[PDB]
Amino acid sequence: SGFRKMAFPSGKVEGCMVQVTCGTTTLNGLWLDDTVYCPRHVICTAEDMLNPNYEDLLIRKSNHSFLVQAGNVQLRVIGHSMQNCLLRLKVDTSNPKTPKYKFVRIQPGQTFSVLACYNGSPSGVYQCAMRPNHTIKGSFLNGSCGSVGFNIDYDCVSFCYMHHMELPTGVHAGTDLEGKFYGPFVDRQTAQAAGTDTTITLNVLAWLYAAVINGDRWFLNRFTTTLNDFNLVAMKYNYEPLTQDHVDILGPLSAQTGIAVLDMCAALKELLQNGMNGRTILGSTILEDEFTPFDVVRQCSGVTFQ
Amino acid sequence: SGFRKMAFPSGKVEGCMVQVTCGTTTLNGLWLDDTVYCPRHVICTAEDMLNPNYEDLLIRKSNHSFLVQAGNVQLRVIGHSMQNCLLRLKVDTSNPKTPKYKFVRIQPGQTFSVLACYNGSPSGVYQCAMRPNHTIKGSFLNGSCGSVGFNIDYDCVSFCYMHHMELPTGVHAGTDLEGKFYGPFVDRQTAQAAGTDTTITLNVLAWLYAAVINGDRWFLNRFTTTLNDFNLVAMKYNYEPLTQDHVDILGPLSAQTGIAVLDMCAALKELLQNGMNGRTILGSTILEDEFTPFDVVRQCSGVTFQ
Ligand SMILES: *[C@@H](CC(=O)OCC)[C@H](C[C@@H]1CCNC1=O)NC(=O)[C@H](Cc1ccccc1)NC(=O)[C@H](COC(C)(C)C)NC(=O)OCc1ccccc1
Ligand SMILES: *[C@@H](CC(=O)OCC)[C@H](C[C@@H]1CCNC1=O)NC(=O)[C@H](Cc1ccccc1)NC(=O)[C@H](COC(C)(C)C)NC(=O)OCc1ccccc1
Known part of the structure; x- marks a missing residue:
């Protein structure tokens, strides 16, 4: 529980984190095989962060312009290139800890x-x-x-x-x-x-299922809703519209709890309209939207506390 | 921010997590140097989890009663002993990843x-x-x-x-x-x-300081309180009594924000009595009590957003 x-x-x-230094600017880089990835803004002059032309800034650099430190070990840069807003630095050593x-x-x-x-x-x-x-x-x-x-x-x-x-x-x-x-x-x-x-509706619904799996049903109700009627309410409360794809994604959680998705939507509609009446859900006084259906399945028991 | x-x-x-098996029971163990630590309830018979006598259960075990697996590698147990509610298993290999x-x-x-x-x-x-x-x-x-x-x-x-x-x-x-x-x-x-x-008062106060460091002051007030008058309110709301030691611990956060501890206590008193008026603090609609003063100092800037 x-x-x-x-x-x-x-x-x-x-095991992949390194330090990248150009001039007086230091930031983090990601070391995979023989490449170090880092934000290209590491090459910005101290005087110009407003209008950098990165192509013009980079052509002025050599390989030895860049210092790469992995723990206490210096990695020699042997090539560089820009890819969109990152730099790809080639180094003399492949990371032995590359996953x-x-x-x-x-x-x-x-x-x-x-x-x-x-x-x-x-x-x-x-x-x-x-x-x-x-x-x-x-x-x-x-x-x-x-x-x-x-x-x-x-x-x-x-x-x-x-x-x-x-x-x-x-x-x-x-x-x-x-x-x-x-x-x-x-x-x-x-x-x-x-x-x-906007509030991530799919995630709020996933988290309501998590609450049921873990043994709490207080917020359910006898009602159902159509997808379109739910969405009228969603617009009012700044929730993302619910789609049939989102309904299908919720299939496994619906099956484990025996609560139809549109019935959970009715429960959510009621929570939006009426509030939570001083009650909590999974220790929260608000509706949480940062757990995905996948996250709920990863963390909750596969057996509902009925 | x-x-x-x-x-x-x-x-x-x-790098220290291993699997420990006795009979049909498997759980996790912690491998440091040449020792594996695990809950002693790994030796409970399937039939008796109500009244185990662990001394009597353990004396019936040999070293080869215990199987220890580190990844796909079997570690040979070469000694065992009970320490309070854990078992200390000696193994044939010291963990090369021991921090x-x-x-x-x-x-x-x-x-x-x-x-x-x-x-x-x-x-x-x-x-x-x-x-x-x-x-x-x-x-x-x-x-x-x-x-x-x-x-x-x-x-x-x-x-x-x-x-x-x-x-x-x-x-x-x-x-x-x-x-x-x-x-x-x-x-x-x-x-x-x-x-x-009980609610961890010291932590709630630390978190109010975190909110100030990060730029929010809405919940402050013109008042102060004595430690004893604060504690009368704390008792009413199921908060731990605040002590002078807790006041001293909050010194560094008080100094960085320019808010005296007892003035922050007055702010907290008002929040307990009046609620938060539909407002949030650091994105929370409630008073958070799982961040210590040390946790706030670790995570927040050393410069207050004034
Ligand atoms: C990482 C690099 C760093 O630490 O540089 C030294 C300050 C840092 C990450 C932030 C630091 C605090 N929290 C963070 O998440 N990133 C930066 O400082 C960005 C550097 C940069 C970006 C692009 C070109 C060149 C340099 N800059 C910003 O994040 C910047 C805000 O600066 C700070 C110092 C206040 C964090 N953001 C920004 O400019 O947004 C656009 C904007 C919006 C409104 C008005 C003006 C500009
Ligand atoms: C770890 C071991 C395990 O998984 O065994 C297989 C079930 C497990 C951790 C819990 C599993 C779910 N969440 C957990 O945190 N620990 C246990 O199952 C404990 C095993 C044990 C303890 C002491 C002696 C022998 C065995 N037992 C309990 O946690 C038990 C609750 O059991 C479950 C299966 C429902 C989790 N708790 C317990 O007995 O508390 C005392 C109590 C309270 C009220 C009525 C009766 C007993």
Whole structure:
């Protein structure tokens, strides 16, 4: 029993974190086989973070412009190239701790673990959702750039995020490991703001199923709803519209609990309209939207506490 | 910016997790140097979990009664002994991945990271506080026994918890790494219940400081309180009494924000009496009590957003 925001074990990722220095700028890099990946803003001049031309900045660099440190060991850079908003540095040594890995671009509403890092040294690990507005609600300080997000399946690490910047609202923006930003953001310190965010409906429903699996039914009701009638309410409360695909994704959780998806939607409709009446769900006074259906299945028992 | 429940990176601990089997019972063990530590209830007969006499059960075992698996490698047991509620198994191989480590008994209100494990395989990592009633609000399923809790300072792992049991309320009980239970619990399936819990006042105050450091002041007020007058209110709302030692611990956070501890106590008094008026603090609609002053200092900027 219990239900916690749970990150993946971070060991396979810790073995890949290095420090990258260009001029007086230091940030984190990710070392896989003979390549080190890092945010390309490491090459920005101290004087110009507003209008960098990265092609013009990079052509002025040699391999020995870049210093790469893995623990106390210096890695010699033997090649470099830009890929979108990252740099790919070739080094003289393949990382002996390289795990089985893939690069994946995650989708809005999906979750991942973040390994917060400073000066190539891992400091903490926590779970994040990719928000509908393509930001994450992370926890990052100066020095955290190049920290990575990932998921693990069996023994394969799926890297999905590298950290680049903080927006005015205190939320975070970054790229996949091909260097393409999540959302409309750009790596320059020109004024940018996160779009309006939305509550991840699918995740709220998954979490209500988690609550039932774990033994709590207080918030259910005798009613049902149509998908379209639910969506009228969803719009009012700034929830994402529910789709048939989302209904199908919830099949396994529905089956384990014996609660039809549209019946759980009716329960959710009532919670939105009436509130929770001073009660909690899985220890929460609010409706949680950062657990996916996959996350619920991973963490909860396969046997419902009936 | 941001504020998240953040666990320590788990790699140093993952390298120590093994599987221990006696008869048909399998659980997790912790492998450090040439010793494997695990819950002694691994030796319980399938028929008797109510009244085991562990001395009588253990004397009936040989070294080869115990099977220890590290990944796909079998570790030969060459000695065994009971220490309180754990078994200490001596094995033929010292763990080459043994980190610098200490065993520490943590105190109520303090936090640690839990590495949830099944069949010797780490599955997830999350942060827990030791509750005043000596339980933790974990997330554990069948097979999780022997999962460990820890903190990390510099490169030293301070192990503080090994998991043994779940109580009727869905909360968790276990031992330190000397095998002594936290709280009045015993490792037998005789009826037991967690004592009434209390809110960790020191942590709530630390978290209010975190909110100020990160830029939010909405909940402050023009008032102060005496320690004793605060405690009258604390009793009413089931908060731990605040002591001068707790006031002294909050010195550094008070200094960084320019908010005197008793002034923050007045702010907290008002929040208890009046509620939060539909507002949130660090994204929370309630008062969070699972971040210590140390946790706040670890995670927040050393510069207040004034
Ligand atoms: C990682 C690098 C670093 O630490 O540099 C030293 C400050 C850092 C990660 C953030 C630090 C605190 N929390 C974080 O998540 N990233 C940066 O500082 C970004 C650096 C950069 C990006 C692109 C080109 C060149 C440099 N910059 C930002 O995150 C910046 C905010 O700066 C700080 C110092 C306040 C964090 N964000 C930004 O410029 O957003 C666009 C914007 C929005 C509104 C007004 C102006 C600009
Ligand atoms: C770890 C071992 C395991 O998985 O065994 C197979 C079930 C497991 C961890 C819990 C599983 C689910 N969540 C957990 O945190 N621990 C146990 O199952 C404990 C085993 C044990 C303890 C002491 C002597 C011998 C065996 N037992 C319990 O946690 C038990 C609850 O059992 C389950 C199966 C429902 C989890 N708790 C208990 O007996 O508490 C005392 C009590 C309270 C009220 C009425 C009767 C007894």
